[model samples]
Target: AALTQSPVSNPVTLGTSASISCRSTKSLLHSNGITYLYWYLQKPGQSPQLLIYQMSNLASGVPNRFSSSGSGTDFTLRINTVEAEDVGVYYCAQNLELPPTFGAGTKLELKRADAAPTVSIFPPSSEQLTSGGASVVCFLNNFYPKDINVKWKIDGSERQNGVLNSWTDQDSKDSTYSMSSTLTLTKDEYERHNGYTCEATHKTSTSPIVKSF
Candidate 1:
Protein backbone atom coordinates (compact mmCIF):
# COMPACT_ATOMS: atom_id res chain seq x y z
CA ALA A 1 0.00 0.00 0.00
CA ALA A 2 1.27 3.47 -0.83
CA LEU A 3 2.02 6.04 1.87
CA THR A 4 0.83 9.64 1.49
CA GLN A 5 2.42 12.47 3.47
CA SER A 6 0.21 15.53 3.21
CA PRO A 7 0.07 19.34 3.50
CA VAL A 8 2.80 18.82 0.87
CA SER A 9 4.26 22.19 1.85
CA ASN A 10 4.45 23.22 5.54
CA PRO A 11 5.78 26.71 6.28
CA VAL A 12 6.30 27.53 9.94
CA THR A 13 7.78 30.72 11.27
CA LEU A 14 11.03 30.39 13.16
CA GLY A 15 10.46 29.61 16.87
CA THR A 16 6.95 28.33 16.11
CA SER A 17 5.68 24.77 15.79
CA ALA A 18 4.89 22.75 12.66
CA SER A 19 2.97 19.53 12.07
CA ILE A 20 3.11 17.26 9.00
CA SER A 21 0.62 14.50 8.31
CA CYS A 22 1.31 11.07 6.88
CA ARG A 23 -1.25 8.42 6.00
CA SER A 24 -0.85 4.81 5.06
CA THR A 25 -3.29 2.98 2.82
CA LYS A 26 -3.23 -0.02 5.20
CA SER A 27 -2.46 -0.77 8.82
CA LEU A 28 1.29 -0.62 9.41
CA LEU A 29 1.38 -2.94 12.42
CA HIS A 30 3.74 -5.77 11.64
CA SER A 31 3.31 -9.30 12.94
CA ASN A 32 6.28 -8.63 15.24
CA GLY A 33 3.81 -6.35 17.07
CA ILE A 34 5.20 -2.91 16.31
CA THR A 35 3.97 -0.24 13.95
CA TYR A 36 6.66 0.18 11.32
CA LEU A 37 5.89 3.76 10.31
CA TYR A 38 8.98 5.98 10.26
CA TRP A 39 9.81 9.65 9.64
CA TYR A 40 12.69 11.06 7.59
CA LEU A 41 13.98 14.36 6.17
CA GLN A 42 16.19 15.66 3.36
CA LYS A 43 18.05 18.91 3.73
CA PRO A 44 20.07 20.83 1.17
CA GLY A 45 23.23 18.85 0.41
CA GLN A 46 22.43 16.29 3.09
CA SER A 47 21.30 12.70 2.79
CA PRO A 48 17.79 11.62 3.74
CA GLN A 49 17.96 11.17 7.50
CA LEU A 50 15.75 9.12 9.79
CA LEU A 51 14.11 11.41 12.34
CA ILE A 52 11.57 9.09 13.98
CA TYR A 53 11.09 5.37 13.97
CA GLN A 54 8.40 2.91 15.09
CA MET A 55 6.00 5.87 14.86
CA SER A 56 7.20 7.94 17.83
CA ASN A 57 10.68 7.00 19.02
CA LEU A 58 13.29 9.61 18.13
CA ALA A 59 16.29 8.46 16.18
CA SER A 60 19.71 8.81 17.77
CA GLY A 61 20.93 12.43 18.08
CA VAL A 62 17.64 13.89 16.89
CA PRO A 63 16.56 16.91 18.94
CA ASN A 64 13.60 16.40 21.29
CA ARG A 65 11.96 19.37 19.55
CA PHE A 66 10.65 16.77 17.11
CA SER A 67 7.92 14.31 18.07
CA SER A 68 5.25 12.17 16.44
CA SER A 69 1.88 10.54 17.19
CA GLY A 70 -0.97 8.63 15.59
CA SER A 71 -1.84 5.04 14.72
CA GLY A 72 -3.29 2.53 12.27
CA THR A 73 -3.39 4.46 9.00
CA ASP A 74 -2.60 8.02 10.08
CA PHE A 75 0.33 9.75 11.78
CA THR A 76 1.82 13.19 12.36
CA LEU A 77 5.38 14.41 12.85
CA ARG A 78 5.56 17.55 14.92
CA ILE A 79 8.29 20.13 15.30
CA ASN A 80 8.42 22.46 18.32
CA THR A 81 9.83 26.00 18.06
CA VAL A 82 11.31 25.62 14.63
CA GLU A 83 14.97 26.52 14.26
CA ALA A 84 17.13 27.41 11.26
CA GLU A 85 18.58 23.89 11.27
CA ASP A 86 15.09 22.40 11.03
CA VAL A 87 14.29 23.62 7.54
CA GLY A 88 14.05 20.87 4.90
CA VAL A 89 11.78 18.24 3.37
CA TYR A 90 10.09 15.58 5.56
CA TYR A 91 8.89 12.13 4.61
CA CYS A 92 7.37 8.92 6.03
CA ALA A 93 7.84 5.25 5.26
CA GLN A 94 6.33 1.83 6.06
CA ASN A 95 8.31 -1.38 6.43
CA LEU A 96 5.66 -3.79 7.69
CA GLU A 97 5.63 -5.67 4.41
CA LEU A 98 8.06 -6.75 1.71
CA PRO A 99 9.27 -3.94 -0.52
CA PRO A 100 8.85 -0.93 1.75
CA THR A 101 6.69 2.00 0.65
CA PHE A 102 7.18 5.79 1.09
CA GLY A 103 5.05 8.91 1.19
CA ALA A 104 4.83 11.63 -1.46
CA GLY A 105 6.69 13.84 1.08
CA THR A 106 6.51 17.42 2.46
CA LYS A 107 8.81 20.42 2.61
CA LEU A 108 9.28 22.42 5.84
CA GLU A 109 10.21 26.07 5.60
CA LEU A 110 9.65 29.62 6.87
CA LYS A 111 6.77 31.98 6.03
CA ARG A 112 9.20 34.19 4.11
CA ALA A 113 11.12 32.41 1.35
CA ASP A 114 13.47 33.11 -1.57
CA ALA A 115 17.25 32.64 -1.53
CA ALA A 116 18.60 30.52 -4.33
CA PRO A 117 21.97 28.88 -3.84
CA THR A 118 25.05 30.25 -5.59
CA VAL A 119 25.99 27.41 -7.91
CA SER A 120 29.42 26.39 -9.20
CA ILE A 121 31.24 23.30 -10.37
CA PHE A 122 34.72 22.61 -9.13
CA PRO A 123 37.27 22.30 -11.88
CA PRO A 124 37.97 18.72 -12.89
CA SER A 125 40.43 16.91 -10.67
CA SER A 126 43.46 15.66 -12.57
CA GLU A 127 44.15 12.94 -10.00
CA GLN A 128 40.82 11.20 -10.69
CA LEU A 129 41.24 11.56 -14.43
CA THR A 130 44.70 10.00 -14.39
CA SER A 131 43.69 7.17 -12.08
CA GLY A 132 40.45 6.25 -13.86
CA GLY A 133 37.19 7.13 -12.09
CA ALA A 134 37.18 10.81 -13.00
CA SER A 135 34.86 13.07 -11.01
CA VAL A 136 33.14 16.41 -11.57
CA VAL A 137 32.17 18.10 -8.33
CA CYS A 138 29.70 20.94 -7.81
CA PHE A 139 29.29 23.38 -4.96
CA LEU A 140 26.27 25.30 -3.61
CA ASN A 141 26.60 28.20 -1.21
CA ASN A 142 24.40 30.61 0.76
CA PHE A 143 20.94 29.54 -0.30
CA TYR A 144 17.74 29.61 1.75
CA PRO A 145 14.20 28.38 2.08
CA LYS A 146 16.74 25.63 2.68
CA ASP A 147 15.84 23.06 0.03
CA ILE A 148 17.45 22.18 -3.31
CA ASN A 149 17.75 19.47 -5.97
CA VAL A 150 20.97 19.03 -7.99
CA LYS A 151 21.74 16.92 -11.01
CA TRP A 152 24.41 16.34 -13.64
CA LYS A 153 24.41 16.44 -17.41
CA ILE A 154 27.21 15.29 -19.69
CA ASP A 155 27.10 16.88 -23.12
CA GLY A 156 23.85 15.49 -24.54
CA SER A 157 22.83 13.20 -21.67
CA GLU A 158 21.54 13.60 -18.12
CA ARG A 159 23.31 11.41 -15.58
CA GLN A 160 21.55 9.36 -12.92
CA ASN A 161 24.35 6.98 -11.95
CA GLY A 162 27.67 7.71 -10.26
CA VAL A 163 26.40 10.91 -8.68
CA LEU A 164 27.18 11.53 -5.00
CA ASN A 165 25.57 14.53 -3.31
CA SER A 166 26.23 15.59 0.32
CA TRP A 167 26.61 18.53 2.69
CA THR A 168 29.18 20.30 4.81
CA ASP A 169 27.38 22.15 7.63
CA GLN A 170 25.22 25.21 8.10
CA ASP A 171 27.02 28.49 8.49
CA SER A 172 26.37 29.69 12.02
CA LYS A 173 26.35 33.37 11.14
CA ASP A 174 24.45 33.22 7.84
CA SER A 175 21.97 30.42 8.50
CA THR A 176 22.34 29.79 4.77
CA TYR A 177 23.41 26.30 3.55
CA SER A 178 26.19 24.70 1.54
CA MET A 179 26.49 21.30 -0.10
CA SER A 180 28.47 19.35 -2.70
CA SER A 181 27.72 16.94 -5.52
CA THR A 182 30.10 14.75 -7.52
CA LEU A 183 29.50 12.85 -10.71
CA THR A 184 31.99 10.14 -11.57
CA LEU A 185 32.73 8.58 -14.92
CA THR A 186 35.23 6.22 -16.42
CA LYS A 187 38.30 7.86 -17.93
CA ASP A 188 37.03 7.16 -21.43
CA GLU A 189 33.63 8.65 -20.78
CA TYR A 190 35.04 11.64 -18.93
CA GLU A 191 37.43 12.57 -21.68
CA ARG A 192 34.90 11.86 -24.40
CA HIS A 193 32.24 14.20 -23.10
CA ASN A 194 32.66 17.79 -24.27
CA GLY A 195 31.28 19.29 -21.11
CA TYR A 196 29.78 18.45 -17.69
CA THR A 197 27.01 20.59 -16.29
CA CYS A 198 25.85 20.82 -12.73
CA GLU A 199 22.25 21.96 -12.41
CA ALA A 200 20.49 22.99 -9.20
CA THR A 201 16.80 23.79 -8.69
CA HIS A 202 15.82 25.69 -5.56
CA LYS A 203 12.43 26.64 -4.14
CA THR A 204 13.04 30.34 -4.75
CA SER A 205 14.60 30.19 -8.19
CA THR A 206 12.21 30.12 -11.11
CA SER A 207 14.77 28.20 -13.17
CA PRO A 208 17.52 25.86 -12.07
CA ILE A 209 21.00 27.37 -12.40
CA VAL A 210 23.46 25.46 -14.56
CA LYS A 211 27.27 25.59 -14.39
CA SER A 212 29.75 23.75 -16.55
CA PHE A 213 33.03 22.05 -15.72
Candidate 2:
Protein backbone atom coordinates (compact mmCIF):
# COMPACT_ATOMS: atom_id res chain seq x y z
CA ALA A 1 0.00 0.00 0.00
CA ALA A 2 1.09 3.56 -0.72
CA LEU A 3 1.09 6.64 1.48
CA THR A 4 -0.76 9.83 0.63
CA GLN A 5 0.41 13.28 1.60
CA SER A 6 -2.40 15.80 1.87
CA PRO A 7 -2.69 19.49 0.93
CA VAL A 8 0.19 19.03 -1.51
CA SER A 9 0.92 22.72 -1.39
CA ASN A 10 1.51 24.05 2.11
CA PRO A 11 2.54 27.71 2.37
CA VAL A 12 3.32 29.42 5.63
CA THR A 13 4.70 32.74 6.66
CA LEU A 14 8.23 33.00 7.97
CA GLY A 15 8.34 32.62 11.75
CA THR A 16 5.06 30.73 11.61
CA SER A 17 4.31 27.02 11.68
CA ALA A 18 3.65 24.43 8.99
CA SER A 19 1.74 21.17 9.31
CA ILE A 20 1.48 18.34 6.79
CA SER A 21 -0.56 15.17 6.97
CA CYS A 22 0.29 11.67 5.84
CA ARG A 23 -2.09 8.75 5.66
CA SER A 24 -1.04 5.17 5.14
CA THR A 25 -3.19 2.75 3.23
CA LYS A 26 -2.56 0.09 5.90
CA SER A 27 -2.16 0.33 9.62
CA LEU A 28 1.44 1.20 10.60
CA LEU A 29 1.34 0.01 14.17
CA HIS A 30 3.97 -2.63 14.73
CA SER A 31 4.28 -5.47 17.20
CA ASN A 32 7.01 -3.59 19.04
CA GLY A 33 6.63 -0.18 20.66
CA ILE A 34 7.71 1.90 17.67
CA THR A 35 5.48 2.58 14.70
CA TYR A 36 6.98 1.94 11.27
CA LEU A 37 6.20 5.40 9.90
CA TYR A 38 9.18 7.65 9.21
CA TRP A 39 9.55 11.26 8.09
CA TYR A 40 12.19 12.90 5.95
CA LEU A 41 12.89 16.31 4.44
CA GLN A 42 14.80 17.18 1.33
CA LYS A 43 16.30 20.58 0.90
CA PRO A 44 17.19 22.09 -2.44
CA GLY A 45 20.34 20.74 -4.07
CA GLN A 46 20.56 18.17 -1.29
CA SER A 47 19.61 14.58 -0.67
CA PRO A 48 16.66 13.44 1.40
CA GLN A 49 17.68 13.28 5.04
CA LEU A 50 15.88 11.61 7.88
CA LEU A 51 14.19 14.01 10.25
CA ILE A 52 11.79 11.98 12.32
CA TYR A 53 12.20 8.26 12.72
CA GLN A 54 9.69 5.76 14.07
CA MET A 55 6.92 8.34 13.81
CA SER A 56 8.00 10.32 16.86
CA ASN A 57 11.71 10.01 17.61
CA LEU A 58 13.72 12.88 16.18
CA ALA A 59 16.66 11.80 14.13
CA SER A 60 20.07 12.83 15.34
CA GLY A 61 20.99 16.38 14.33
CA VAL A 62 17.32 17.10 13.67
CA PRO A 63 16.17 20.27 15.35
CA ASN A 64 13.82 20.31 18.29
CA ARG A 65 11.22 22.33 16.42
CA PHE A 66 10.31 19.44 14.16
CA SER A 67 7.78 17.07 15.69
CA SER A 68 5.48 14.23 14.61
CA SER A 69 2.84 12.00 16.18
CA GLY A 70 0.06 9.63 15.21
CA SER A 71 -1.16 6.03 15.30
CA GLY A 72 -2.83 3.44 13.10
CA THR A 73 -3.12 4.87 9.57
CA ASP A 74 -3.08 8.65 10.08
CA PHE A 75 -0.03 10.72 10.97
CA THR A 76 1.21 14.30 10.81
CA LEU A 77 4.49 16.20 10.63
CA ARG A 78 4.70 19.66 12.14
CA ILE A 79 7.40 22.25 11.72
CA ASN A 80 7.72 25.04 14.25
CA THR A 81 9.30 28.50 13.70
CA VAL A 82 9.44 28.33 9.97
CA GLU A 83 12.41 29.80 8.17
CA ALA A 84 13.90 29.82 4.70
CA GLU A 85 16.19 26.98 5.74
CA ASP A 86 13.18 24.78 6.45
CA VAL A 87 11.84 25.20 2.95
CA GLY A 88 11.75 21.96 1.00
CA VAL A 89 9.70 18.83 0.25
CA TYR A 90 8.63 16.63 3.15
CA TYR A 91 7.77 12.97 2.82
CA CYS A 92 6.53 10.13 4.98
CA ALA A 93 7.60 6.53 4.58
CA GLN A 94 6.91 3.11 6.06
CA ASN A 95 9.02 -0.01 6.62
CA LEU A 96 6.88 -2.18 8.86
CA GLU A 97 6.20 -4.69 6.12
CA LEU A 98 7.77 -6.36 3.12
CA PRO A 99 8.38 -3.58 0.64
CA PRO A 100 8.92 -0.17 2.17
CA THR A 101 6.90 2.63 0.59
CA PHE A 102 7.30 6.39 0.59
CA GLY A 103 4.70 9.10 0.28
CA ALA A 104 4.43 11.56 -2.56
CA GLY A 105 6.31 14.65 -1.50
CA THR A 106 4.50 17.55 0.18
CA LYS A 107 6.08 20.91 -0.46
CA LEU A 108 6.51 23.71 2.06
CA GLU A 109 7.12 27.30 1.05
CA LEU A 110 6.71 30.91 2.05
CA LYS A 111 3.38 32.73 1.82
CA ARG A 112 3.90 33.48 -1.87
CA ALA A 113 2.30 30.14 -2.53
CA ASP A 114 0.39 31.33 -5.53
CA ALA A 115 3.54 31.83 -7.54
CA ALA A 116 3.17 29.99 -10.83
CA PRO A 117 6.03 28.29 -12.58
CA THR A 118 7.21 29.66 -15.92
CA VAL A 119 7.69 27.20 -18.74
CA SER A 120 10.39 27.74 -21.32
CA ILE A 121 11.59 25.27 -23.92
CA PHE A 122 15.08 24.68 -25.32
CA PRO A 123 15.51 22.60 -28.43
CA PRO A 124 18.06 19.85 -28.84
CA SER A 125 21.56 21.01 -29.50
CA SER A 126 23.41 20.68 -32.82
CA GLU A 127 25.70 18.10 -31.25
CA GLN A 128 22.76 15.90 -30.28
CA LEU A 129 21.17 16.29 -33.70
CA THR A 130 24.39 15.28 -35.39
CA SER A 131 24.41 12.11 -33.32
CA GLY A 132 21.00 11.16 -34.84
CA GLY A 133 19.11 11.86 -31.62
CA ALA A 134 17.47 14.99 -30.20
CA SER A 135 15.72 15.96 -27.03
CA VAL A 136 13.66 19.08 -26.48
CA VAL A 137 13.75 20.19 -22.88
CA CYS A 138 11.01 22.14 -21.10
CA PHE A 139 12.28 24.36 -18.33
CA LEU A 140 10.01 24.84 -15.29
CA ASN A 141 11.17 27.60 -13.04
CA ASN A 142 10.22 29.76 -10.05
CA PHE A 143 7.33 27.84 -8.47
CA TYR A 144 6.50 27.60 -4.82
CA PRO A 145 5.29 24.66 -2.72
CA LYS A 146 6.29 21.95 -5.18
CA ASP A 147 3.88 19.11 -5.97
CA ILE A 148 3.57 20.54 -9.46
CA ASN A 149 2.20 18.25 -12.18
CA VAL A 150 3.68 18.35 -15.66
CA LYS A 151 2.28 16.71 -18.79
CA TRP A 152 2.85 16.71 -22.49
CA LYS A 153 0.41 17.07 -25.42
CA ILE A 154 1.71 16.41 -28.90
CA ASP A 155 -0.18 16.61 -32.19
CA GLY A 156 -3.54 16.79 -30.35
CA SER A 157 -2.86 13.53 -28.52
CA GLU A 158 -1.41 12.64 -25.15
CA ARG A 159 2.11 11.25 -25.50
CA GLN A 160 3.77 9.17 -22.81
CA ASN A 161 7.10 8.54 -24.44
CA GLY A 162 9.75 11.18 -25.05
CA VAL A 163 8.76 12.79 -21.78
CA LEU A 164 11.66 12.86 -19.33
CA ASN A 165 9.84 14.13 -16.25
CA SER A 166 12.63 15.22 -13.96
CA TRP A 167 12.65 15.99 -10.26
CA THR A 168 12.08 19.28 -8.42
CA ASP A 169 14.75 21.48 -6.91
CA GLN A 170 14.17 24.33 -4.48
CA ASP A 171 16.28 27.42 -4.63
CA SER A 172 18.47 27.80 -1.58
CA LYS A 173 17.83 31.55 -1.50
CA ASP A 174 14.28 32.22 -2.67
CA SER A 175 13.02 28.79 -1.59
CA THR A 176 11.11 28.35 -4.86
CA TYR A 177 10.96 25.06 -6.76
CA SER A 178 12.19 24.36 -10.29
CA MET A 179 11.96 21.36 -12.61
CA SER A 180 12.81 20.30 -16.16
CA SER A 181 11.07 17.87 -18.52
CA THR A 182 12.46 16.49 -21.73
CA LEU A 183 10.81 15.36 -24.94
CA THR A 184 13.04 12.77 -26.49
CA LEU A 185 12.79 12.06 -30.20
CA THR A 186 14.74 10.59 -33.03
CA LYS A 187 15.72 12.62 -36.09
CA ASP A 188 12.83 11.36 -38.22
CA GLU A 189 10.26 11.61 -35.45
CA TYR A 190 11.40 15.08 -34.42
CA GLU A 191 11.09 16.33 -37.99
CA ARG A 192 7.56 14.89 -38.41
CA HIS A 193 6.03 16.37 -35.27
CA ASN A 194 4.43 19.73 -35.99
CA GLY A 195 3.02 20.78 -32.60
CA TYR A 196 4.55 20.22 -29.18
CA THR A 197 3.17 21.67 -25.99
CA CYS A 198 4.24 21.27 -22.38
CA GLU A 199 1.47 21.62 -19.77
CA ALA A 200 1.95 22.17 -16.05
CA THR A 201 -0.44 22.62 -13.11
CA HIS A 202 0.49 24.28 -9.83
CA LYS A 203 -1.24 25.63 -6.74
CA THR A 204 -1.42 28.95 -8.56
CA SER A 205 -4.86 29.48 -10.13
CA THR A 206 -3.74 29.70 -13.72
CA SER A 207 -5.08 27.10 -16.11
CA PRO A 208 -1.53 25.95 -16.83
CA ILE A 209 1.83 27.19 -17.90
CA VAL A 210 1.60 26.16 -21.54
CA LYS A 211 4.61 26.47 -23.80
CA SER A 212 4.01 25.51 -27.38
CA PHE A 213 6.64 24.81 -29.98
Candidate 3:
Protein backbone atom coordinates (compact mmCIF):
# COMPACT_ATOMS: atom_id res chain seq x y z
CA ALA A 1 0.00 0.00 0.00
CA ALA A 2 1.08 3.66 -0.54
CA LEU A 3 1.25 6.50 2.03
CA THR A 4 -0.02 10.09 1.84
CA GLN A 5 0.33 13.52 3.54
CA SER A 6 -1.83 16.60 4.02
CA PRO A 7 -1.09 19.27 1.43
CA VAL A 8 -0.65 22.92 2.30
CA SER A 9 -2.87 25.49 0.52
CA ASN A 10 0.24 27.42 -0.65
CA PRO A 11 4.02 27.37 -0.45
CA VAL A 12 4.80 27.21 3.29
CA THR A 13 6.65 30.23 4.61
CA LEU A 14 9.39 29.88 7.30
CA GLY A 15 9.29 33.44 8.49
CA THR A 16 11.53 33.37 11.60
CA SER A 17 10.25 29.84 12.36
CA ALA A 18 8.13 27.09 10.86
CA SER A 19 6.76 23.61 11.52
CA ILE A 20 5.38 20.99 9.09
CA SER A 21 4.22 17.43 9.86
CA CYS A 22 2.43 14.36 8.42
CA ARG A 23 0.02 12.00 10.17
CA SER A 24 -1.02 8.59 8.89
CA THR A 25 -4.41 8.33 7.18
CA LYS A 26 -4.71 5.22 9.31
CA SER A 27 -2.90 4.89 12.64
CA LEU A 28 0.56 3.66 11.60
CA LEU A 29 1.56 4.20 15.19
CA HIS A 30 -1.49 2.52 16.72
CA SER A 31 -1.44 -0.30 14.19
CA ASN A 32 2.30 -1.01 14.17
CA GLY A 33 3.40 1.56 16.70
CA ILE A 34 6.05 4.22 15.85
CA THR A 35 8.61 1.86 14.29
CA TYR A 36 7.05 2.17 10.83
CA LEU A 37 7.29 5.95 10.45
CA TYR A 38 10.32 7.63 8.80
CA TRP A 39 10.98 11.09 7.33
CA TYR A 40 12.93 12.40 4.30
CA LEU A 41 13.76 15.52 2.29
CA GLN A 42 13.88 16.18 -1.47
CA LYS A 43 15.08 19.46 -2.85
CA PRO A 44 13.78 20.85 -6.15
CA GLY A 45 15.97 18.68 -8.39
CA GLN A 46 17.51 15.91 -6.32
CA SER A 47 16.61 12.40 -5.34
CA PRO A 48 14.67 12.11 -2.10
CA GLN A 49 17.35 11.68 0.58
CA LEU A 50 16.72 9.88 3.88
CA LEU A 51 15.93 12.37 6.65
CA ILE A 52 14.51 10.68 9.78
CA TYR A 53 14.97 6.97 9.43
CA GLN A 54 13.24 4.74 12.07
CA MET A 55 10.88 7.67 12.65
CA SER A 56 12.93 9.81 15.02
CA ASN A 57 16.72 9.37 15.04
CA LEU A 58 18.53 12.09 13.07
CA ALA A 59 21.07 10.77 10.59
CA SER A 60 24.74 10.75 11.66
CA GLY A 61 26.47 14.15 11.66
CA VAL A 62 23.09 15.88 11.85
CA PRO A 63 23.09 19.14 13.80
CA ASN A 64 21.90 19.50 17.42
CA ARG A 65 18.80 21.62 16.78
CA PHE A 66 17.15 19.13 14.40
CA SER A 67 15.19 16.38 16.19
CA SER A 68 12.14 14.04 16.20
CA SER A 69 10.22 12.43 19.06
CA GLY A 70 6.81 10.81 19.02
CA SER A 71 5.10 7.55 19.90
CA GLY A 72 2.14 5.48 18.70
CA THR A 73 -0.37 6.84 16.11
CA ASP A 74 0.32 10.55 16.59
CA PHE A 75 3.79 11.84 15.60
CA THR A 76 5.42 15.18 14.84
CA LEU A 77 8.26 16.50 12.64
CA ARG A 78 9.96 19.58 14.00
CA ILE A 79 12.64 21.96 12.76
CA ASN A 80 14.09 23.60 15.91
CA THR A 81 15.12 26.76 14.09
CA VAL A 82 14.22 27.37 10.48
CA GLU A 83 17.54 27.57 8.70
CA ALA A 84 17.67 28.81 5.08
CA GLU A 85 19.08 25.48 3.94
CA ASP A 86 16.18 23.70 5.66
CA VAL A 87 13.88 24.76 2.81
CA GLY A 88 12.54 21.86 0.80
CA VAL A 89 9.81 19.20 0.65
CA TYR A 90 10.03 16.92 3.72
CA TYR A 91 8.53 13.42 3.44
CA CYS A 92 7.83 10.48 5.79
CA ALA A 93 8.11 6.78 4.97
CA GLN A 94 7.21 3.44 6.51
CA ASN A 95 9.88 0.75 6.75
CA LEU A 96 7.41 -1.93 7.76
CA GLU A 97 6.81 -3.06 4.20
CA LEU A 98 9.33 -5.01 2.18
CA PRO A 99 11.22 -2.59 -0.13
CA PRO A 100 9.78 0.08 2.17
CA THR A 101 7.27 2.72 1.03
CA PHE A 102 7.21 6.50 1.61
CA GLY A 103 4.62 9.12 2.53
CA ALA A 104 3.99 12.43 0.77
CA GLY A 105 6.27 15.16 2.23
CA THR A 106 5.72 18.68 3.47
CA LYS A 107 7.69 21.58 1.97
CA LEU A 108 9.92 23.38 4.50
CA GLU A 109 11.76 26.74 4.44
CA LEU A 110 14.28 28.58 6.58
CA LYS A 111 13.08 31.62 8.47
CA ARG A 112 16.71 32.24 9.53
CA ALA A 113 19.16 29.92 7.75
CA ASP A 114 20.87 30.20 4.31
CA ALA A 115 20.12 28.31 1.08
CA ALA A 116 18.18 25.10 0.68
CA PRO A 117 20.14 21.87 0.48
CA THR A 118 21.25 21.02 -3.06
CA VAL A 119 21.78 17.24 -3.25
CA SER A 120 23.05 14.77 -5.88
CA ILE A 121 22.95 10.94 -5.89
CA PHE A 122 24.73 8.62 -8.32
CA PRO A 123 23.02 5.60 -9.87
CA PRO A 124 23.23 2.48 -7.69
CA SER A 125 26.33 0.51 -8.58
CA SER A 126 24.08 -2.56 -8.60
CA GLU A 127 20.86 -4.14 -7.26
CA GLN A 128 20.40 -7.73 -6.16
CA LEU A 129 17.45 -9.92 -5.14
CA THR A 130 17.80 -12.91 -2.86
CA SER A 131 16.37 -14.80 0.10
CA GLY A 132 19.15 -13.46 2.37
CA GLY A 133 23.02 -13.06 2.74
CA ALA A 134 26.13 -11.15 4.12
CA SER A 135 26.89 -8.19 1.75
CA VAL A 136 26.49 -4.67 3.16
CA VAL A 137 27.56 -1.04 2.58
CA CYS A 138 28.22 1.69 5.22
CA PHE A 139 28.37 5.46 4.63
CA LEU A 140 28.27 8.78 6.49
CA ASN A 141 28.57 12.59 5.98
CA ASN A 142 31.28 15.02 7.16
CA PHE A 143 31.16 15.43 10.90
CA TYR A 144 33.60 16.85 13.48
CA PRO A 145 34.34 13.41 14.93
CA LYS A 146 35.12 10.34 12.81
CA ASP A 147 33.60 7.19 14.34
CA ILE A 148 31.68 5.11 11.80
CA ASN A 149 31.53 1.69 10.09
CA VAL A 150 29.33 -0.63 7.92
CA LYS A 151 28.21 -4.26 8.17
CA TRP A 152 26.52 -7.11 6.28
CA LYS A 153 24.15 -9.55 7.97
CA ILE A 154 21.92 -12.58 7.53
CA ASP A 155 19.46 -14.00 10.11
CA GLY A 156 20.74 -11.61 12.78
CA SER A 157 24.35 -12.69 12.33
CA GLU A 158 26.98 -10.19 11.04
CA ARG A 159 29.13 -10.77 7.97
CA GLN A 160 32.89 -10.93 8.29
CA ASN A 161 35.21 -8.17 7.06
CA GLY A 162 32.57 -5.68 5.87
CA VAL A 163 34.36 -2.85 4.02
CA LEU A 164 33.68 0.80 4.97
CA ASN A 165 34.04 3.92 2.80
CA SER A 166 32.93 7.59 2.77
CA TRP A 167 33.31 11.09 1.18
CA THR A 168 32.42 14.76 1.78
CA ASP A 169 32.28 18.15 0.00
CA GLN A 170 33.45 21.17 2.00
CA ASP A 171 31.75 23.48 -0.46
CA SER A 172 28.47 21.64 0.03
CA LYS A 173 26.71 21.16 3.36
CA ASP A 174 24.55 18.26 2.30
CA SER A 175 23.79 16.08 5.35
CA THR A 176 25.74 12.89 5.08
CA TYR A 177 27.83 15.04 2.75
CA SER A 178 25.91 13.21 0.04
CA MET A 179 28.50 10.47 0.55
CA SER A 180 27.81 6.77 -0.16
CA SER A 181 29.42 3.41 -1.05
CA THR A 182 28.21 -0.02 -2.28
CA LEU A 183 29.02 -3.70 -1.61
CA THR A 184 28.85 -6.54 -4.11
CA LEU A 185 28.47 -10.15 -3.04
CA THR A 186 28.52 -13.53 -4.72
CA LYS A 187 25.11 -15.07 -5.46
CA ASP A 188 25.94 -17.68 -2.85
CA GLU A 189 26.53 -14.98 -0.27
CA TYR A 190 23.33 -13.19 -1.26
CA GLU A 191 21.40 -16.47 -1.25
CA ARG A 192 22.32 -16.64 2.39
CA HIS A 193 20.75 -13.19 2.69
CA ASN A 194 18.87 -10.80 0.41
CA GLY A 195 20.84 -7.51 0.11
CA TYR A 196 23.21 -5.04 1.80
CA THR A 197 23.11 -1.48 3.14
CA CYS A 198 25.20 1.51 4.46
CA GLU A 199 25.28 2.02 8.26
CA ALA A 200 27.60 3.81 10.73
CA THR A 201 28.06 5.13 14.29
CA HIS A 202 28.73 8.73 15.40
CA LYS A 203 30.96 9.26 18.41
CA THR A 204 30.07 12.93 18.78
CA SER A 205 26.50 12.04 19.66
CA THR A 206 24.90 9.49 21.98
CA SER A 207 22.58 7.93 19.39
CA PRO A 208 24.15 6.42 16.29
CA ILE A 209 22.28 6.52 12.96
CA VAL A 210 22.03 3.22 11.11
CA LYS A 211 20.96 3.22 7.40
CA SER A 212 20.38 0.13 5.29
CA PHE A 213 19.43 -0.26 1.61
Best by TM-score: 2
Model 2: per-residue Cα lDDT over 70-107, one tens digit each:
87799989888887778778999998897889998898
- All candidates' TM-scores? 0.55, 0.57, 0.43
Q: Rate the local accuracy (lDDT) of all candidates.
A: 0.80, 0.82, 0.51
Q: Give Cα distance to truth, residue 139, candidate 2, Å.
A: 13
**Candidate 3, run of 10 with poorest lDDT:** 112-121
- lDDT per residue (tens digit) for residues 104-126 in model 3: 67655322222222222222234
lDDT score, candidate 3: 0.51
Residue-wise C-alpha lDDT for candidate 1, range 31-126, written one tens digit per residue: 777889999988766799999999878999999999988877988899998887776778999878879888878877555445678888875678
When 1 and 3 are scored with lDDT, the better candidate is: 1
Error of 3 at 142 (Å): 30
Q: Which order, best to worst by TM-score?
A: 2, 1, 3
In the predicted model 1, the residue pairs found to clash are none
TM-score of 1: 0.55
Ranking 1 against 2 by lDDT, winner: 2
